[PDB]
């Protein structure tokens, strides 16, 4: 079922997934919230920002009820980056690579 909440042990597996992403060589743009010194109009454009540090805090605080909610935050990190950045940018590239890695790791967690 997808309505089934995460258990305490499931939370250790999500942490492993989140940490595998933070260790990936293409994760550099997403480790921390976008710095306005690097992208002065970013928060004028992206109204629902997310980053890997924010997800880590939310995993530590047990913010997520269901795996679908965790997946929604993750997918926003990538969809925001493609919405903001042009398709030929290094950022957009990181988002394509890291999203496929996340799908491979998410299939592993689900079964």
């Amino acid at each position: 079922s997808v309505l089934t909440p995460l258990t305490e042990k499931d939370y250790e597996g999500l942490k492993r997934v989140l940490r595998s992403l933070q260790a990936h060589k293409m994760a550099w743009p997403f480790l921390e919230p976008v710095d306005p010194n690097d992208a002065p109009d970013y928060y004028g454009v992206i109204k629902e920002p997310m980053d890997l540090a924010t997800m880590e805090e939310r995993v530590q605080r047990r913010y997520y009820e269901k795996l679908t909610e965790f997946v929604a935050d993750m997918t926003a990190i990538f969809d925001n980056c493609r919405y903001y950045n042009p398709s030929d940018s290094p950022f957009y590239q990181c988002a394509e690579v890291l999203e496929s890695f996340f799908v491979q790791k998410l299939k592993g967690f689900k079964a």
């Binding site: 690097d38 992208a39 109009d41 970013y42 950045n85 042009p86 950022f91």
Partner: peptide, 8 residues
């Protein structure tokens, strides 16, 4: 590259 919002 520096981050800037796409226009196309």
């Amino acid at each position: 590259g520096a981050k800037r919002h796409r226009k196309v």
